[PDB]
Ligand binder design. Structure first.
Ligand SMILES: [Mg+2]
Ligand SMILES: [Mg+2]
Ligand SMILES: [Mg+2]
Ligand SMILES: [Mg+2]
Ligand SMILES: [Mg+2]
Ligand SMILES: [Mg+2]
Ligand SMILES: [Mg+2]
Ligand SMILES: [Mg+2]
Length: 50
RNA sequence: AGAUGGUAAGGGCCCACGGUGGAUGCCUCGGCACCCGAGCCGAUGAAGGACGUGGCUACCUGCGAUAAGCCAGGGG
């Protein structure tokens, strides 16, 4: 769990973004919603040791 | 008595200009053949797909719920 509880947080954030997108209120789309390239797989990469 | 000339609804032929049409000419990221290199993939789940994934994405190419992409090395 050295990298978890962070993607739970960032997937919570992306289900603030996808809420904000459906109503007409998401005015930085690719500036925010394509976080999941570097962010979000920011800490979805470790070698599963042991 | 007397004759040729005429009338063009429309037709014919020719000339001029159009439309329809897609031939011809000229192109090539396309294809064919030949010669070279290369030559297997799969329980470490293949070939092939269905579905999906872009913020809006219909389709194609991707790519798999990490879903036009992730991480590291190398080239630029
Ligand atoms: Mg003339
Ligand atoms: Mg003509
Ligand atoms: Mg024509
Ligand atoms: Mg051949
Ligand atoms: Mg396959
Ligand atoms: Mg797809
Ligand atoms: Mg998409
Ligand atoms: Mg979408």
């Amino acid at each position: 769990e050295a990298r978890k509880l962070s993607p739970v947080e960032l997937e919570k954030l992306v289900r603030e973004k996808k809420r904000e997108l459906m109503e007409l209120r998401f005015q930085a789309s690719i500036g925010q919603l394509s976080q999941n390239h570097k962010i979000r797989d920011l800490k979805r990469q470790i070698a599963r040791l042991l």
